[PDB]
């Protein structure tokens, strides 16, 4: 049981895949209709195209939820999160679906409310706009009234970078103000302070009140160290960060300008940042921008530097999903395949390509390399003659005929199969000049004997082809450029000579 | 003791001896000076180059009488028709000077103006326009009274065509009617006519009736010859009347005479026979003796008639005539070695070379005949002088590039070729051709000494410091290459990035 309209969306998707626009339809659609198995098959295929899109995760889950089967909602949530890790908004929508949709009867949901906050930060909190994420995470651990969870979330925090570091200083201090010291610290970490004054100094409640005052202000004095140096390494990057204008996924296309600015900005954290930083701010100009091969392949470059297998995950994550057609990246790819030593998956990656994309140039031309380069040459062979056998344009074949008949000749010698193979291509088209060139270079590069009578037959059939062309002329031409170089009597360069002017004349008449 | 100008006019002859204009003033200069020896000097060299211009020998002549130095007229007019024996003007000069200048008194004069007749059509009188040569021979012949001789001068020139046949005709006819018959012939001719009169079947009627009958019996023979000779002149109106200047000039023809000429010659060769033919071939050489096209036919011909006078007409033709217009040269040369003397085209060759200053197609035969008959050394020494030489620096690349190609796959030494190769680079360093054949050259050999070999080939292509497109389409080949053999991929991955870089790098500037 299904929508009526809904095959005919659908079959959009199912031939353009990467026609967004066809998914946009479809899913207001399924929305609109609201029927449930339906916009499960839809969202799922759609997902897998194009995860980095987090609204329409949001709007999955919100209609899993209205028709009251949360259990699938929460599986959507995480799902969503497995593919981008990286959307704030996508965390705190699932923070707050489990506010929804909690029974605080149960001790657990707090423990598993914990669990996700600490995931969402050491997943996402190091972007530079994760501040509301952090802010509910501090209101979260005040109003259960733990705020010595609180001082451990502003310690973590104020060791990070964010667009407003400045509101998240004025609320620690504020919360230092109007708080007790004894609840903020673990013992130990109050203890020690207040040795430390002693150390300076070398029941009385008024002389407490001067005791607890001066921990503020020592506490202060630190932390406002500590956040003049994350100033300081914010203002590095205030002008780079606030250059980017979308710093979420969208099918538009991006400017150049901000192409420039993400660029300039890796590289900037490259240079300083920690390795970590650089891999999150990757991963971030990998989720905007998804659709630029470049980046993507600087980041395999970046991820070779650290020898590790992840560029293998990155390549997949670029060629599997998002750019599947642009070749230039699956081709990189195979080149890093074959460079590690895993071998016939490159050939894997080849045959699915070829396989989505009706055959291309740089596609069989490495397919073949590869063949070749390895030994397995009769697959090499295979692969032109299949390559000629379905070719679409008569030039097109004669391309691929000549690749084969270079490749045979130059590397497994037999040069009468060569022969046979542009012979074939010539009875094919007979017309493009290419095959006969290749061919005479060939018989040349022979000695002047075997193929010295060949090369006089490549020349004849070359000039009294079937229909006259001022090319033949130019064969004339090098006939007698070749025979007054080299020649056996002078007897041939004479009637080679006449064959020339009857054709200047022959020409002239027509 | 020479005229004042003179020089001047000299150094232009001195200059461009074929500004046949520069002649023409110099020659009324000499003339309105009345030089002698000056006009000797000039008319000599200037005949030498263009003779078949016959009124200027005729004007020599003139000088030559009007300073009374007889002996040397006649010199001259020997000279002119041993150098054109087809000018009737020309023969018809000699003989009414002769006329002018001889002493009846001497029996010898007679005879010697018999033999100059008789040379004169013996060498022209079968020009279609050699009408008053034979009349003034008819004429000659009749005021001397041998009415014999006058009769075998018909009988000779009826045999041939004419503009005026039927003047000719009418002559012969008006001939027999107003003298004796008894005169006209031999005896013998007389008496075998008489007996023939017997075999149809004193007295003055009757020898009056023999008479006429025997003077209307030899109309009717020389009727019946002359209808003959008539059908052959009909079929040869058209073309002969086609010709518009039967005489050499040096404006150029329009190429309808040029088709004339050449159909009309054509025909004769058909039907004329071989000698008929050969006169009006050397006809056709005179008038529109510029164009090689002809002479060229001439030598084609004269080769099936099996004779050296190709040879002949070669020099006539190289020597003479265009000494510059290379095809003409090229061929004699080639035939020179059809024969088998050899070192004689070898020596044309170098003769038309010293002329016209080094040209591609002299260089080029040059080498392949001392290539083809094995003198290698003398081959690549050829070449040699040809880099020494060059003006041009793409023309000592050329002439390199084809002493590689010979070096190389003639006289193998690979090596060698390279290493000229690069000569010609570090001279040139900026033409494609060269790097192309190079490339071609190391690729002909295995793709392994020649892979290092191609890489540092690609590598100054790539590295060259030409900021040209030219650059980019060798990145594209070095990369289309190594994609159709390569060692191993971080070669090709490393070429493409220096491909993009480069890509870049030309697209900012």
């Given at each position: 049981?299904?929508?009526?309209?809904?095959?005919?969306?659908?079959?959009?998707?199912?031939?353009?895949?990467?026609?967004?626009?066809?998914?946009?339809?479809?899913?207001?659609?399924?929305?609109?209709?609201?029927?449930?198995?339906?916009?499960?098959?839809?969202?799922?295929?759609?997902?897998?195209?194009?995860?980095?899109?987090?609204?329409?995760?949001?709007?999955?889950?919100?209609?899993?939820?209205?028709?009251?089967?949360?259990?699938?909602?929460?599986?959507?949530?995480?799902?969503?999160?497995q593919a981008?890790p990286?959307?704030?908004?996508?965390?705190?929508?699932?923070?707050?679906?489990?506010?929804?949709?909690?029974?605080?009867?149960?001790?657990?949901?707090?423990?598993?409310?914990?669990?996700?906050?600490?995931?969402?930060?050491?997943?996402?909190?190091?972007?530079?706009?994760?501040?509301?994420?952090?802010?509910?995470?501090?209101?979260?651990?005040?109003?259960?009234?733990?705020?010595?969870?609180?001082?451990?979330?502003?310690?973590?925090?104020?060791?990070?970078?964010?667009?407003?570091?400045?509101?998240?200083?004025?609320?620690?201090?504020?919360?230092?103000?109007?708080?007790?010291?004894?609840?903020?610290?673990?013992?130990?970490?109050?203890?020690?302070?207040?040795?430390?004054?002693?150390?300076?100094?070398?029941?009385?409640?008024?002389?407490?009140?001067?005791?607890?005052?001066?921990?503020?202000?020592?506490?202060?004095?630190?932390?406002?160290?500590?956040?003049?140096?994350?100033?300081?390494?914010?203002?590095?990057?205030?002008?780079?960060?606030?250059?980017?204008?979308?710093?979420?996924?969208?099918?538009?296309?991006?400017?150049?300008?901000?192409?420039?600015?993400?660029?300039?900005?890796?590289?900037?954290?490259?240079?300083?940042?920690?390795?970590?930083?650089?891999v999150?701010?990757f991963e971030?100009?990998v989720?905007?921008?998804?659709?630029?091969?470049?980046?993507w392949?600087?980041y395999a470059?970046y991820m070779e530097?650290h020898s590790i297998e992840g560029v293998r995950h990155v390549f997949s994550r670029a060629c599997t999903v998002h750019?599947?057609?642009?070749?230039?990246a699956?081709?990189?790819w195979?080149?890093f395949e074959?460079?590690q030593?895993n071998?016939?998956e490159?050939?894997?990656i080849?045959?699915?390509?070829?396989?989505?994309?009706?055959?291309?140039?740089?596609?069989?031309?490495?397919?073949?390399?590869?063949?070749?380069?390895?030994?397995?040459?009769?697959?090499?062979?295979?692969?032109?003659?299949?390559?000629?056998?379905?070719?679409?344009?008569?030039?097109?074949?004669?391309?691929?005929?000549?690749?084969?008949?270079?490749?045979?000749?130059?590397?497994?010698?037999?040069?009468?199969?060569?022969?046979?193979?542009?012979?074939?291509?010539?009875?094919?088209?007979?017309?493009?000049?290419?095959?006969?060139?290749?061919?005479?270079?060939?018989?040349?590069?022979?000695?002047?004997?075997?193929?010295?009578?060949?090369?006089?037959?490549?020349?004849?059939?070359?000039?009294?082809?079937?229909?006259?062309?001022?090319?033949?002329?130019?064969?004339?031409?090098?006939?007698?450029?070749?025979?007054?170089?080299?020649?056996?009597?002078?007897?041939?360069?004479?009637?080679?000579?006449?064959?020339?002017?009857?054709?200047?004349?022959?020409?002239?008449?027509?």
């Amino acid at each position: 049981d299904f929508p009526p309209e809904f095959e005919k969306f659908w079959k959009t998707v199912e031939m353009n895949p990467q026609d967004f626009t066809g998914w946009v339809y479809l899913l207001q659609y399924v929305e609109q209709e609201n029927h449930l198995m339906a916009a499960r098959k839809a969202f799922d295929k759609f997902f897998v195209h194009y995860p980095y899109c987090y609204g329409y995760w949001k709007k999955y889950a919100d209609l899993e939820k209205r028709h009251d089967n949360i259990k699938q909602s929460d599986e959507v949530y995480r799902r969503g999160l497995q593919a981008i890790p990286l959307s704030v908004d996508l965390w705190i929508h699932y923070i707050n679906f489990l506010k929804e949709t909690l029974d605080p009867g149960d001790q657990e949901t707090n423990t598993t409310i914990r669990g996700t906050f600490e995931h969402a930060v050491l997943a996402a909190g190091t972007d530079f706009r994760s501040d509301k994420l952090w802010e509910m995470y501090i209101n979260w651990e005040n109003e259960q009234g733990n705020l010595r969870e609180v001082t451990a979330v502003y310690d973590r925090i104020l060791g990070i970078p964010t667009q407003l570091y400045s509101h998240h200083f004025q609320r620690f201090k504020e919360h230092v103000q109007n708080n007790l010291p004894r609840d903020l610290l673990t013992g130990e970490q109050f203890i020690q302070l207040r040795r430390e004054l002693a150390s300076v100094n070398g029941t009385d409640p008024a002389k407490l009140i001067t005791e607890i005052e001066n921990m503020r202000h020592r506490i202060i004095e630190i932390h406002q160290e500590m956040f003049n140096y994350n100033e300081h390494e914010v203002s590095k990057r205030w002008t780079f960060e606030e250059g980017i204008k979308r710093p979420y996924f969208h099918v538009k296309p991006l400017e150049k300008a901000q192409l420039k600015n993400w660029k300039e900005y890796l590289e900037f954290e490259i240079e300083n940042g920690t390795h970590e930083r650089v891999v999150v701010l990757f991963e971030r100009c990998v989720i905007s921008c998804a659709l630029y091969e470049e980046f993507w392949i600087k980041y395999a470059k970046y991820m070779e530097n650290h020898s590790i297998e992840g560029v293998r995950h990155v390549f997949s994550r670029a060629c599997t999903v998002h750019l599947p057609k642009k070749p230039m990246a699956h081709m990189l790819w195979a080149a890093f395949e074959e460079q590690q030593g895993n071998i016939n998956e490159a050939r894997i990656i080849l045959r699915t390509f070829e396989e989505c994309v009706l055959g291309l140039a740089m596609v069989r031309l490495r397919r073949v390399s590869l063949e070749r380069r390895h030994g397995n040459m009769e697959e090499a062979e295979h692969l032109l003659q299949d390559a000629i056998k379905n070719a679409k344009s008569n030039n097109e074949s004669s391309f691929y005929a000549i690749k084969l008949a270079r490749h045979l000749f130059k590397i497994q010698k037999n040069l009468p199969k060569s022969r046979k193979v542009l012979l074939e291509a010539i009875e094919k088209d007979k017309e493009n000049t290419k095959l006969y060139l290749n061919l005479l270079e060939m018989e040349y590069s022979c000695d002047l004997k075997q193929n010295e009578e060949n090369i006089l037959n490549c020349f004849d059939k070359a000039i009294h082809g079937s229909l006259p062309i001022k090319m033949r002329i130019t064969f004339s031409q090098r006939k007698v450029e070749f025979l007054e170089d080299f020649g056996s009597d002078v007897n041939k360069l004479l009637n080679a000579y006449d064959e020339h002017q009857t054709l200047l004349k022959e020409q002239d008449t027509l």
